[PDB]
Design an enzyme around this catalytic site. Structure first.
Site, PDB file in Angstrom:
ATOM      1  N   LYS A 250      36.901  44.553  30.117  1.00 15.53           N
ATOM      2  CA  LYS A 250      37.578  45.817  29.873  1.00 15.53           C
ATOM      3  C   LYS A 250      38.570  45.741  28.717  1.00 15.53           C
ATOM      4  CE  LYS A 250      37.123  48.463  34.053  1.00 15.53           C
ATOM      5  NZ  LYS A 250      37.752  48.721  35.357  1.00 15.53           N
ATOM      6  N   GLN A 310      35.498  37.604  44.214  1.00 12.90           N
ATOM      7  CA  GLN A 310      34.681  38.495  43.403  1.00 12.90           C
ATOM      8  C   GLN A 310      34.373  37.732  42.122  1.00 12.90           C
ATOM      9  OE1 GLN A 310      37.606  41.576  43.297  1.00 12.90           O
ATOM     10  NE2 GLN A 310      38.357  41.022  41.259  1.00 12.90           N
ATOM     11  N   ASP A 345      33.770  45.499  35.324  1.00 11.66           N
ATOM     12  CA  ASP A 345      33.820  44.131  34.828  1.00 11.66           C
ATOM     13  C   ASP A 345      33.599  43.089  35.916  1.00 11.66           C
ATOM     14  OD1 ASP A 345      36.219  45.062  35.919  1.00 11.66           O
ATOM     15  OD2 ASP A 345      37.506  43.850  34.615  1.00 11.66           O
ATOM     16  N   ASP A 380      43.408  39.250  47.325  1.00  6.28           N
ATOM     17  CA  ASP A 380      43.119  40.514  46.675  1.00  6.28           C
ATOM     18  C   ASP A 380      42.145  41.337  47.526  1.00  6.28           C
ATOM     19  OD1 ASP A 380      43.442  41.812  43.779  1.00  6.28           O
ATOM     20  OD2 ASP A 380      41.322  42.001  44.334  1.00  6.28           O
ATOM     21  N   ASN A 381      42.502  42.589  47.837  1.00  4.80           N
ATOM     22  CA  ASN A 381      41.607  43.523  48.516  1.00  4.80           C
ATOM     23  C   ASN A 381      40.827  42.935  49.710  1.00  4.80           C
ATOM     24  OD1 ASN A 381      42.086  45.894  46.854  1.00  4.80           O
ATOM     25  ND2 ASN A 381      40.661  45.130  45.309  1.00  4.80           N
ATOM     26  N   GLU A 409      46.592  41.882  50.594  1.00  8.00           N
ATOM     27  CA  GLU A 409      46.789  43.066  49.756  1.00  8.00           C
ATOM     28  C   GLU A 409      45.815  44.148  50.170  1.00  8.00           C
ATOM     29  OE1 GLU A 409      44.762  43.610  46.392  1.00  8.00           O
ATOM     30  OE2 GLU A 409      45.774  45.491  45.945  1.00  8.00           O
ATOM     31  N   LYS A 520      47.540  44.500  32.687  1.00  8.48           N
ATOM     32  CA  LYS A 520      46.284  43.991  33.226  1.00  8.48           C
ATOM     33  C   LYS A 520      45.259  43.803  32.101  1.00  8.48           C
ATOM     34  CE  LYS A 520      46.027  47.354  36.126  1.00  8.48           C
ATOM     35  NZ  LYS A 520      45.541  48.276  37.172  1.00  8.48           N
ATOM     36  N   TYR A 521      45.406  44.549  31.005  1.00  5.04           N
ATOM     37  CA  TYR A 521      44.415  44.553  29.934  1.00  5.04           C
ATOM     38  C   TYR A 521      44.949  44.156  28.556  1.00  5.04           C
ATOM     39  CZ  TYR A 521      43.056  47.855  33.581  1.00  5.04           C
ATOM     40  OH  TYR A 521      42.825  48.466  34.786  1.00  5.04           O
TER      41      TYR A 521
HETATM   42  O1  LIG Z   1      39.039  42.939  36.712  1.00  8.22           O
HETATM   43  C1  LIG Z   1      38.640  43.743  37.785  1.00  8.22           C
HETATM   44  C2  LIG Z   1      39.693  44.773  37.990  1.00  8.22           C
HETATM   45  O2  LIG Z   1      41.003  44.124  38.045  1.00  8.22           O
HETATM   46  C3  LIG Z   1      42.075  45.094  38.372  1.00  8.22           C
HETATM   47  O3  LIG Z   1      41.847  45.623  39.666  1.00  8.22           O
HETATM   48  C4  LIG Z   1      42.443  44.874  40.748  1.00  8.22           C
HETATM   49  C5  LIG Z   1      41.505  45.167  41.935  1.00  8.22           C
HETATM   50  C6  LIG Z   1      40.194  44.421  41.703  1.00  8.22           C
HETATM   51  O4  LIG Z   1      40.512  43.001  41.888  1.00  8.22           O
HETATM   52  O5  LIG Z   1      42.037  44.696  43.193  1.00  8.22           O
HETATM   53  C7  LIG Z   1      43.416  45.136  43.502  1.00  8.22           C
HETATM   54  F1  LIG Z   1      43.452  46.429  43.794  1.00  8.22           F
HETATM   55  C8  LIG Z   1      44.344  44.786  42.341  1.00  8.22           C
HETATM   56  F2  LIG Z   1      44.494  43.437  42.199  1.00  8.22           F
HETATM   57  F3  LIG Z   1      45.564  45.300  42.681  1.00  8.22           F
HETATM   58  C9  LIG Z   1      43.829  45.320  41.062  1.00  8.22           C
HETATM   59  O6  LIG Z   1      44.761  44.880  40.000  1.00  8.22           O
HETATM   60  C10 LIG Z   1      42.065  46.225  37.369  1.00  8.22           C
HETATM   61  O7  LIG Z   1      42.998  47.257  37.819  1.00  8.22           O
HETATM   62  C11 LIG Z   1      40.724  46.815  37.245  1.00  8.22           C
HETATM   63  O8  LIG Z   1      40.701  47.868  36.247  1.00  8.22           O
HETATM   64  C12 LIG Z   1      39.688  45.794  36.892  1.00  8.22           C
HETATM   65  O9  LIG Z   1      38.408  46.437  36.770  1.00  8.22           O
END
Ligand SMILES: OC[C@H]1O[C@H](O[C@@H]2[C@@H](CO)O[C@H](F)C(F)(F)[C@H]2O)[C@H](O)[C@@H](O)[C@@H]1O
Ligand SMILES: OC[C@H]1O[C@H](O[C@@H]2[C@@H](CO)O[C@H](F)C(F)(F)[C@H]2O)[C@H](O)[C@@H](O)[C@@H]1O
EC number: 2.4.99.16
Lengths: 649, 649
Positions: A250, A310, A345, A380-381, A409, A520-521
């Site tokens: 991303k 993941q 991604d 995570d999740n 989380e 994050k990016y």
């Molecule tokens: O790289 C994958 C994803 O990372 C972030 O999303 C996280 C998500 C997936 O692991 O799990 C949780 F909700 C988190 F850690 F809080 C997120 O940060 C990015 O937001 C996302 O855009 C990206 O595709």
């Protein structure tokens, strides 16, 4: 064989999943064990809690009291000691001495059957003395017996000899217990202090680079650790430190295609460079990581690593373990989702083709990082992986290493959130960020400090890389100060994500809870030195809150919490206590207008009389006050978010 | 072995003492089984209830639905059949077809790789078809599979062929269930109809005598039965029918000294003439009792005998089994109390020296009366005897004779009342007589008809020999009419004590709930023939209520009950339902003034639209009305205490 015992003792609490999962505590934490206790007829009952340690050794004598008139609900406070699996029982019994005293106190002045009554008293005290181990205590009771039987003394005098404080002391410690009846034992899991209590700081090492090398390493990021420790944090939480995929990486601001130097999301784990047991090559080597961990340790910081089960499309697992993924008829794997959010991604893991392989590999990876001093994982999740999968993985890890802490989380529906805690997660993220009005906060914390506290330990992050609430967006710095006060004083565990101190609060767009130019990016270098010099950071407030927590035991526990009435909707007040330490907090939830209010303290709840007034010191400012049943406050946003007062001796 | 399964299914209800006692029902009674069901990720779940009879045979397919959005709480109604010990489990499963349909209905219109989505649905329907037994159902599903796979047809129509009602019908009957997970079985005790539903009449046989022989016999008392059957009662409850002691026999109006021919309290059981297994000489012989039971049976009446485990001082047990009594140091036995009530004419039983002997003699006595056709026992003050004693006795008796019904006369605190029901008592007396305002009745019946109905079956006596409530004292006949309507329509079991229908309401003194000249201490001859002739009786109303109950299934159940708002405090409205039968009741609780009110029905709760209106008939008068969302009522004391309406079909 009857389900109910001679003296009914029913519905012992706390209980988790009807006794199939343990209730939780940490070392030194107090909590109430309760039960429904009563007997047939009109005579008195007594009850007590027997808490047994992992070797089976019972704790101190712990008598219960009825909690409210006519309810037959009895309770006592117990305190967890060393870590391990404990058990507790409630013992119920006829209390014939209390019954006899109540009757004797009436019949002797009335001159009713006094010889009979006094002899009945003597026979009880005799039986009591039988089960008393100390000879001096036995003699005290035998003296009462002989005085009760002394027909040459007046009745009133014979009775009084049985009601002395010296007699009372023996009987409070060694009561005569009739028909003792036990509950079946309930399990209690006692874990280390940090599972309940701790301050958390999240940051991205790659953002702490240099002018020549913008992408930080573990060596350069270790330079943030002293500032983090100086703010009083205990845990540093790092986003995934692994290699990041290139396929469908991303771009900045969550755009679909990365260009050129775009660093990608850390959660898109895996590339030819390695997977979950590898280090991102731009962060350095495993040895650099060990150095970072050692430096954190010397500063009193534990590392929490992100565990995100993941894969990027480039992760080794995609070809080494294809059956860990769900493939569509054309062979492709659908990217993960969390609607309406899309994660193009990454691939989610499929668990039903090879659950044993996945579990074995999951604990192998965790044990790898554990061997490099990581004893805390931020998961995570977890609500997108099977519940029984986590139950198995956590039991496996804690079976050899019970100090390891897992933080769930799971921002999802309440049933799933509670279940994940109940099947083993030491800590949980919560709805904290979406509870901003006085009613929301009062209701939610009443729930967290109530029955949920027997299985859930909340971690109040005031922000995260994915959550910038509209409260902070609209309120600016005064709102950041209010949420920090609330998070730090309402939960024994709280946290912030780096940039919170600078009050970063620009959203991706209106109505979004994403940050603009999310870290994050992209690399996010921050001018920490400038912010300190220009006072555009609330780091001093954060530092002070953690200092107050470190100094006040009432703030390092969860269950003792009480909300006090105020006459303003925007102003909330509450207290927490632990032993002789009492903290009283008053917060103006309005980030934009000054609020004055009257705070009517529930005085007997503070352990005080309604007429009394106590000295308090506001630990945010050093100012002292004298507060009582009704106190005026004026809270100006920007100047004063709150009063955080300790009641003074 | 993990505690949670593949698809989480948690906290199945109903549950009683964590599964250690059974929840209850009677033949034909419906109730809700519920559970918390969810899975990881965002895919759909389904659940169903497996109800198994005493031989392990599963009931029909019983799918559950989510009871409220976002709560993950699922339920379904089940119905009990034959008596015995049943079990139930909840099965939870992934619902892939619902999941796929939801995705397909979105992706197909958007043209988002439609070939792939449709081939995924074909494979699902192929899986679903492989399990269906019906050959016609199978070809119906495989037809949809072929349509889904016909690449020469438009996407929308390929999908539409998978969503036809005849495809829906097949899959509603035989859904595709993934990862089926089951709860552990919970026990259900199913008992005969009378345990939940029945109308009771209490009277004293000795009072139904003759001019030449004032003390009634079983043969003269039998002549009172036809009038009791004609009032529509099912059960006749007799106070103790054993010899009555002379030592400390109480005199008229509960005076301490009996004189001359004072007959004493029937509860003062035992003399040298015999004990609990004997008949009072003046009532006649066992053959006379048999005649009385036979006559009762002819009239459709069951006998309930009073079982009072206590003794007069003249009871043979006193010297034959001295250790069944608690003795004071001078050897005397203190008389029973229920403070501030004193029972100088009886000794209470002591249970902890010879519990085996007492249990053995207790079930021997019960079995004696059971041999003579008594299959119901009203147990006097069970809460002054050990809870575990009743649990044992009731299990022993129901073990050989499951049809025997025990009614607990326990007017005490809620924990004990609830526990007694939970350990085996089929019925319980309640707080009904002390619930007289709209709020009191609303709150209390909400409690009884809610969760408690899984273990407690209420017997609503509008009066007893010991309870003449002030409401009846002050309100006169119209108050007796109100309470009869309330008792008969709010509970499937209700009762009165004779004289109630004559509106006897003279208290012993002001602020007492005792009757003046109580039948407990004297013969109470009542001129029934004269009361009928002169219409000074509400016997016809009682008869009408019981006929209404016999003709309307809604009034023969407990759990379905809804209260409807009115704009007058003195007027209460409620409805009950059982299949197609609906009954709507409106009652004027004011016995002295007419009341006009507007009754705003909750039409959805009646299965009706808010605008809709329905034909009802007031079964007390024959008068028909048309009722909808808001109805005017005018209720006049002595003329129209209430409307008891059935919704017409
Ligand atoms: O790289 C994958 C994803 O990372 C972030 O999303 C996280 C998500 C997936 O692991 O799990 C949780 F909700 C988190 F850690 F809080 C997120 O940060 C990015 O937001 C996302 O855009 C990206 O595709
Ligand atoms: O004969 C003893 C006693 O009988 C009545 O009290 C009953 C009581 C004792 O068995 O138990 C219940 F509460 C009851 F059955 F409802 C009572 O009727 C008399 O009231 C009492 O005066 C008498 O001493």
């Amino acid at each position: 064989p009857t389900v109910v015992g001679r003296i009914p003792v029913l519905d012992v609490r706390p209980v988790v999943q009807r006794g199939r999962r343990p209730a939780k505590a940490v070392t030194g934490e107090s909590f109430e064990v309760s039960a429904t206790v009563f007997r047939e007829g009109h005579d008195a009952v007594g009850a007590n809690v027997v808490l047994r340690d992992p070797r089976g050794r019972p704790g101190p004598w712990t008598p219960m009291r009825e909690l409210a008139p006519g309810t037959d609900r009895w309770g006592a406070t117990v305190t967890a000691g060393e870590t391990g699996t404990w058990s507790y029982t409630v013992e119920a019994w006829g209390d014939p001495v209390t019954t006899w005293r109540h009757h004797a106190r009436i019949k002797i002045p009335a001159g009713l059957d006094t010889d009979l009554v006094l002899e009945e008293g003597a026979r009880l005290y005799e039986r009591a003395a039988a089960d008393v181990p100390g000879r001096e205590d036995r003699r005290e009771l035998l003296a009462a017996v002989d005085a009760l039987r002394d027909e040459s003394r007046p009745a009133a005098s014979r009775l009084a000899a049985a009601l002395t404080p010296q007699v009372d002391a023996v009987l409070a410690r060694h009561p005569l217990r009739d028909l003792v009846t036990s509950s079946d034992p309930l399990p209690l899991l006692v874990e280390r202090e940090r599972a309940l209590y701790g301050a958390w700081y999240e940051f991205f090492p790659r953002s702490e680079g240099t002018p020549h090398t913008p992408h930080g390493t573990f060596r350069t990021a270790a330079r943030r650790l002293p500032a983090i420790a100086a703010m009083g944090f205990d845990v540093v939480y790092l986003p995934p430190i692994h290699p990041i995929g290139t396929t469908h990486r991303k771009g900045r601001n969550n755009t679909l295609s990365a260009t050129g130097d775009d660093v990608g999301s850390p959660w898109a784990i895996g590339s030819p460079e390695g997977g979950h047991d590898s280090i991102h090559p731009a962060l350095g080597t495993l040895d650099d990581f060990d150095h970072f961990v050692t430096e954190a340790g010397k500063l009193g910081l534990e590392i929490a690593l992100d565990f995100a089960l993941q894969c990027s499309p480039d992760h080794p697992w995609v070809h080494k373990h294809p059956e860990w993924f769900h493939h569509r008829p054309d062979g492709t794997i659908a990217h993960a989702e969390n609607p309406p959010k899309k994660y193009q991604d990454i691939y989610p893991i499929a668990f039903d083709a090879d659950p044993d392989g996945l579990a074995t590999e999951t604990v192998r990876i965790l044990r790898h990082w554990m061997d490099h001093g990581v004893r805390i994982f931020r998961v995570d999740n977890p609500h997108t992986k099977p519940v029984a999968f986590w139950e198995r993985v956590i039991a496996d890890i804690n079976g050899t290493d019970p100090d390891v802490i897992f933080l769930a989380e799971a921002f999802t529906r309440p049933a799933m959130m509670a279940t994940l805690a109940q099947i083993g997660f030491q800590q949980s993220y919560t709805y904290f960020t979406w509870r901003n009005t006085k009613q929301e906060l009062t209701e939610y914390l009443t729930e967290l400090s109530g029955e949920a506290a027997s299985y859930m330990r909340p971690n109040f992050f005031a922000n995260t890389p994915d959550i910038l609430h509209a409260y902070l967006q609209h309120g600016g710095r005064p709102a950041f100060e209010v949420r920090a006060v609330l998070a730090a004083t309402l939960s024994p565990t709280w946290g912030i994500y780096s940039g919170y101190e600078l009050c970063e609060n620009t959203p991706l767009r209106e109505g979004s809870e994403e940050y603009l130019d999310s870290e994050k990016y992209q690399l996010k270098p921050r001018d920490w030195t400038r912010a300190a010099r220009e006072g555009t950071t609330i780091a001093p407030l954060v530092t002070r809150l953690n200092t107050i927590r470190r100094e006040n035991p009432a703030l390092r526990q969860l269950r003792d919490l009480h909300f006090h009435p105020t006459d303003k909707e925007e102003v909330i007040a509450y207290s927490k206590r632990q032993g002789s330490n009492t903290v009283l907090v008053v917060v103006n939830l309005d980030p934009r207008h000054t609020q004055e209010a009257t705070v009517s303290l529930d005085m007997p709840q503070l352990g005080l009389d309604w007429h009394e007034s106590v000295p308090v010191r506001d630990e945010l400012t050093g100012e002292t006050y004298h507060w009582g049943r009704a106190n005026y406050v004026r809270l100006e946003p920007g100047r004063t978010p709150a009063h955080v007062c300790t009641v003074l001796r």
